[PDB]
Amino acid sequence: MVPISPIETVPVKLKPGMDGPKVKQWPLTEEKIKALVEICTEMEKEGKISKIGPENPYNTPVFACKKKDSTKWRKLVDFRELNKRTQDFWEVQLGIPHPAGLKKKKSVTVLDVGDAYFSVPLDEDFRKYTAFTIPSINNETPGIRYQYNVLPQGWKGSPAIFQSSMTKILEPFKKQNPDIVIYQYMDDLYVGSDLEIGQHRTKIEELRQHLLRWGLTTPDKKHQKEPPFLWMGYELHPDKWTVQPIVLPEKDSWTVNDIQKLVGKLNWASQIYPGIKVRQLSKLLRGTKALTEVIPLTEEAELELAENREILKEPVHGVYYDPSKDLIAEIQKQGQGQWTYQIYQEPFKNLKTGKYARMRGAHTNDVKQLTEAVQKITTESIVIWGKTPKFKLPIQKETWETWWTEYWQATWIPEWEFVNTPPLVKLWYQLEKEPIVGAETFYVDGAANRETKLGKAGYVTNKGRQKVVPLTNTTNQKTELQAIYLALQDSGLEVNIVTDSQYALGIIQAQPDKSESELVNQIIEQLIKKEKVYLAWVPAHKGIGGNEQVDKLVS
Amino acid sequence: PIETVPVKLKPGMDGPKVKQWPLTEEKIKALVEICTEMEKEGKISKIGPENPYNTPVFAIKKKDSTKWRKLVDFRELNKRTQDFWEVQLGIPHPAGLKKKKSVTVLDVGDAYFSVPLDEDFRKYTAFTIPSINNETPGIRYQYNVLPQGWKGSPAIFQSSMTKILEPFKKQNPDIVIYQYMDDLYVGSDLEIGQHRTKIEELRQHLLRWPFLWMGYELHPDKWTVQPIVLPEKDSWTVNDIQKLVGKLNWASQIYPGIKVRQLSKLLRGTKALTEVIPLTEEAELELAENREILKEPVHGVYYDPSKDLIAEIQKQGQGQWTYQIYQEPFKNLKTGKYARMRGAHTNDVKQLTEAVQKITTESIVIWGKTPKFKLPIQKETWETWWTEYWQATWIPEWEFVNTPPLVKLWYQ
DNA sequence: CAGTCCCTGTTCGGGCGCCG
């Protein structure tokens, strides 16, 4: 006969055709034994745990770990087999709150519900599926087995149920206090208002008593009344916020797992520290698949790590969001496919920073990557503030206009203005729209043998110029690119080029300025040196003009 | 007082599990206000995380409308109940709708909110309202009545809709009325004054039973087609002829009678691209014969009601957009071109969005289906912006392609 | 006409950061 808590239960079922968990316990240390028998006894008197007998043919192992910055221990149930047989839940946690999206509040209070999962009841018909034994001695007493009447820590349904139960309890209080903001993340509650400090504590106590009606305790050890407040890993001051101090490891020998933790902290640090790079550090995490393998730091990876530590030396901070002012986002090119941005409302008062360094595609240009960075910032800004910022971009209006009007794919950038801060993003070469009068016409072609991987590449021109080059360990696609490279090498500043390669033409028409292919990078260098280039395509094997002639040479 | 028509998913398919995407502030505030009124009216009810299903939701504004309209992306749920709204209680498609001089589209989806939904099926209509900066967890609801945008709603309501439209159809035997999703397509050959008068009579006929005041007008008798046309120059260069042979060789996949023998003979040798080539007698003859074949209709091109419609769109530049609708490759059921739409010369995404809506509307009128689109755009670019410009109560299927224009086939 | 190849793209699961 256990009392029923005021919190409405959540009906939890299991996947049909499957039963409950039946897993044997794990032999643990005697230190863990003297830290769980006291928990199952206190939760038994408080009604959070009931004792079962032989009528419960289930079992599940459990372990214990120390709480972060606390003398109290934390108990976790290894429900990995129960989760495989428990129904799926839809997670109501859609993201992580960010301090740059908080608005200025005169009074702020950060609460923390004590015994979060241990205060929300479990479904009645589901408590029988949570069976576990507790041996008082490691090899003497068999130990009486108990069960769970609340949410266990370790079950895949516990977070979703608590987050939904917490919302239902706060809904009447939020309806009675509309001007009070309550950021609700798991058990921690950020409460802010523009009320006076005296009147703010009044509503806080009202909220503490409102939650108490459903058995939710808000102790004083985790009650924060004085700034700075520790919230979501940040330091919340009345007029600014900053990330908690980030410590980078400094080992004399660097392995693989050390770099994975290093790049991770730098990614986390890049939300407020401007100009962080992880290109050369993550470049070391390629190919090698041994987390315990020492990797030497390259000269580029060392200079990158040095410049990041100097950025972390000076203290930085973000500000809060003011809806009465516009959102501004400004991007700079860091080089080598790296971009960094700042989002602010007043000059030099950054809400947050960030970086975009993803290299998508074998061949691309700076304009494509700038467009991708804009799209990333836009989506991030809608999550945090629910609106798109005005952009300040290091690209001329004329440059952007030339790109998007001539590109064959739909592309667009939201309202933006040009900011003249080098290095400016530009198009490094423009293909002509019409054939050039007076320029030599090169008919290029390449062929390769599928078996021997041998091939030829060459050209014929209207003036009688001709070349055929034998190639080893190549492909048809490579020989077609080589043929174009030959025509660019052997021509003047203005040249017309006729190819049948859809593959090659598709790469070059997109005006790439960088490539994972050395051959394409050499083709780009030639295209930049030219004054006029006209690429034309004809179908292969159709007896069309000089294409028929050069086809004979290379095949 | 109405028994719920039982609804079942297709055999071997579970409900939809699609994550909600981030919404702007004005859209979240619109949905919060809308859903609060729907809950007070019992149309939707709050749910918990034990419902593993979810469907994205956002809001739109129709053309020339300042009122927010809740829009659910039931695309996943719709194709998981396909045996219902196509086999059991399907809606016949009138072939005469596309022949009417004027067709008005009426949002009648509000009527679906009066019919209850099958209790065993309500869990599949779950949606989640997000919050700015994740201040609060998602606010989950499920539908208690027939939801707008679900293909099962017009099918279940069809028996009710038939009885409502029965006096009007008897009063006007010439008017063609078609129902697709939340919309009612009313077409007549009456004059513009007579048509809108008859449309208002239909509105009052529905009132005696929040977007019924709107009427988007169409003119399918004025809908044009964009055939493959060949350039006509006074002089021809080597480059002009190379492009022509390239266009004709690709067009041969559609018209098998196209020849390029005489035109290719003009390029014998290794000539400069800008050299003028006079067209021979046989070349003029072959080119003239090719211009006639491109006027003749393609052989064996007809609509198969069992196959899906496919739509390809090409960005031609300067606000020009071409498109083709087909079921089998090179068997195009319709080819067209749009020009000077909203966002022209400034916004590709708005233009592409407008083109998708126009093409879908034409497909609903002509065949009663929406096509699956092949969009010339990056997935991330489209998914960032398309909801900002969407003005329709339905959503078609789409995929993303990248085809460089090796030869300008549909627009010189 | 199929079956490959070459090449480029997306999807996904795990590594790490971080929150509870």
Added chain:
DNA sequence: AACGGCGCCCGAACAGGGACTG
């Protein structure tokens, strides 16, 4: 040694189209 959430950078598995060979 547990659960859920978001982000990044990584590689393996897979898909899809031009193009060549039987």
